Amino acid sequence: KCSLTGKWTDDLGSNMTIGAVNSRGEFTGTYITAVADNPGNITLSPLLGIQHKRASQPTFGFTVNWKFSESTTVFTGQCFIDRNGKEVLKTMWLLRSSVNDISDDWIATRVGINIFTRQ
Amino acid sequence: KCSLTGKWTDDLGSNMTIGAVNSRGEFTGTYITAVADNPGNITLSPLLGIQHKRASQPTFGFTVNWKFSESTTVFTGQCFIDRNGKEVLKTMWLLRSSVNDISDDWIATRVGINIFTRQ
Amino acid sequence: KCSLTGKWTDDLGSNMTIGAVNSRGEFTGTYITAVADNPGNITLSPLLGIQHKRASQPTFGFTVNWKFSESTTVFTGQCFIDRNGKEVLKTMWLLRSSVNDISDDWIATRVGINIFTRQRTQK
Amino acid sequence: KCSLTGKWTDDLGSNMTIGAVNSRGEFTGTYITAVADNPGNITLSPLLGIQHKRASQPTFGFTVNWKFSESTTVFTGQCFIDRNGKEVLKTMWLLRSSVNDISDDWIATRVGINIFTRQRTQK
Ligand SMILES: O=C(O)CCCC[C@@H]1SC[C@@H]2NC(=O)N[C@@H]21
Ligand SMILES: O=C(O)CCCC[C@@H]1SC[C@@H]2NC(=O)N[C@@H]21
Ligand SMILES: O=C(O)CCCC[C@@H]1SC[C@@H]2NC(=O)N[C@@H]21
Ligand SMILES: O=C(O)CCCC[C@@H]1SC[C@@H]2NC(=O)N[C@@H]21
């Protein structure tokens, strides 16, 4: 079983810590990004998500509520057991910016990947 | 203030119900999709997310843990007050499939939009 | 129907003109966006793409090489013929911004949708 | 450097060959994917794209018109020259599947990334 509980680093140098996974697959955590729109403002930020409970390589999603920006990032992906029996999260993300008017919604969503491994 | 609490329908005919938003911006809810990979299997499914607390048009994210599939969808977007003072969620989503091997990860992530309004 | 040749408008109010589609489904065109990072700078920009040639509701893609910034957008989608014979392009796009250092690559790609129908009226 | 002309391999083991880039930054090429929805069907497929012409680390896009399915992929990204002069394409893609009814459009677009470097060895 691959599970999300524990400390992770992604390929950008960001680190996150994910707490215990409950009976419904729910979890909370913290995220410290290495990169940002304004790197001088980066603070620790909370995350909340759900993983599938029974699968050995479960898919999951989480939302990061950035404490230094009006932006939100969502991550979704799959917790894999790699060739060496080590856990790897392959994720894709959407980074949503706050726009002042619905008419500028088109500009507001960045997309990307991240690979996480244990710290 | 636009907030997520309440009942919503999206442009595909899906409906969701979002509970009270807590002091940290956290919320839970339910989702009944009108469309699916296998429509004959569609069951009510739970969601969990975070919205920014203080903004009048906050950004948010949520994860839907599908009860009839190993897939997960994440939604992120912004809660807008439209020209008539009505609430509209403009969202983008990533639909993550479960793949059996890390080598097939490339195939696993669909992307799309949804507009939600009150039921 | 669903030859991309012609004039099209999207939901944001951008216009595009696509030329003849050749035997290989290849086409060029021009694009006038209604929105941009720096909207004061907007100028007509060229596109190049390919559609599937024999499909009645073909998928397709094209690239817009913006002439007023260092960005590039690609669109991909499908031309549908609706229950009234009306052509509708449903597209998704990626808008790539130029960054200088590979370590900033993560920041550089936006995603979105557009719906296009043929320009309704002539000048 | 960062003329797209040449042979490239991505992280999935696909290969592509891009021809001369013209004065407008336009190029054609061929693509042999290492992976597919139906991998038994894979055949060489044409591409067409545009890169920014004067930028040293240009952004670009291209469309692949798959010859063995009704799908289309677009790639967009940026050619970087790393601290050793090595060229690296960092791309994101959208892969559009054909559906029959507009009401199924929501299901039809996948998203992903690829990293390309020039083919290292000749046959
Ligand atoms: O700058 C912001 O607007 C908030 C922080 C965003 C950090 C992003 S989330 C996706 C990517 N992966 C990371 O590890 N950090 C960046
Ligand atoms: O079929 C599945 O794999 C699970 C259900 C996915 C339903 C998707 S989520 C994005 C889109 N918006 C909706 O309202 N439903 C579909
Ligand atoms: O801002 C730029 O540098 C180039 C213009 C980008 C315009 C984008 S492309 C996707 C979206 N759809 C449009 O019609 N215009 C915007
Ligand atoms: O499956 C198909 O019908 C067409 C082939 C799709 C291959 C995709 S395109 C994006 C990804 N990168 C590759 O090198 N190949 C896959």
Residue numbers in the entry:
A (entry chain B), B (entry chain B): 3 to 121
C (entry chain A), D (entry chain A): 3 to 125
What does the paper say about this structure?
Common to all members of the avidin protein family is their high affinity towards a small ligand, D-biotin. Despite their relatively low amino acid sequence identity, all avidins share a highly similar tertiary structure, an eight-stranded β-sheet barrel structure, where the biotin-binding site is located at the open end of the barrel. With the exception of rhizavidin, shwanavidin and bradavidin II, all of the structurally characterized natural avidins are stable homotetramers with four biotin-binding sites, one on each monomer. We have previously created functional chimeric avidins using DNA shuffled sequences of AVD and avidin related protein 2 (AVR2).
Here, we present the crystal structure of the previously characterized chimeric mutant A/A2-1, which proves that the avidin fold is robust and suitable for extensive genetic manipulation. In addition, size exclusion chromatography indicated an oligomeric state smaller than a tetramer. Therefore, in order to better understand the structural origin of the physicochemical properties, the structure of mutant A/A2-1 was solved in complex with biotin at 1.8 Å resolution. Two monomers were found in the asymmetric unit and, as expected based on the high sequence identity to its parental proteins AVD and AVR2, the quaternary structure was homotetrameric, each monomer having an eight-stranded β-sheet barrel structure with the biotin-binding site located at the open end of the barrel. The sequence and structural differences to AVD are in the region derived from AVR2, starting at A38 of the L3,4-loop of A/A2-1 and ending with S58 of the L4,5-loop, whereas A/A2-1 differs from AVR2 at the N- and C-terminal regions originating from AVD. As observed in the crystal structure, D12 of A/A2-1 hydrogen bonds with the ureido oxygen of biotin in low pH conditions. A/A2-1 was crystallized at acidic conditions (pH near 4), and hence the X-ray structure of A/A2-1 represents a snapshot of conditions near the pKa of D12, where about 50% of the D12 residues in the crystal would be expected, if exposed to solvent, to be protonated. In the A/A2-1 structure the OD2 oxygen atom of D12 is surrounded by aromatic and nonpolar residues that would act to reduce the effective dielectric constant (in comparison to bulk water), effectively raising the pKa value and increasing the probability of a protonated D12. This would support the formation of a stable hydrogen bond at pH 4, thus explaining the hydrogen bond observed in the crystal structure. In the L3,4-loop of AVR2, AVR4 and A/A2-1, there is a proline residue, which introduces rigidity, and the loop is further stabilized by the intermonomeric salt bridge between D39 and R112 for A/A2-1 and reported earlier for AVR2 and AVR4.
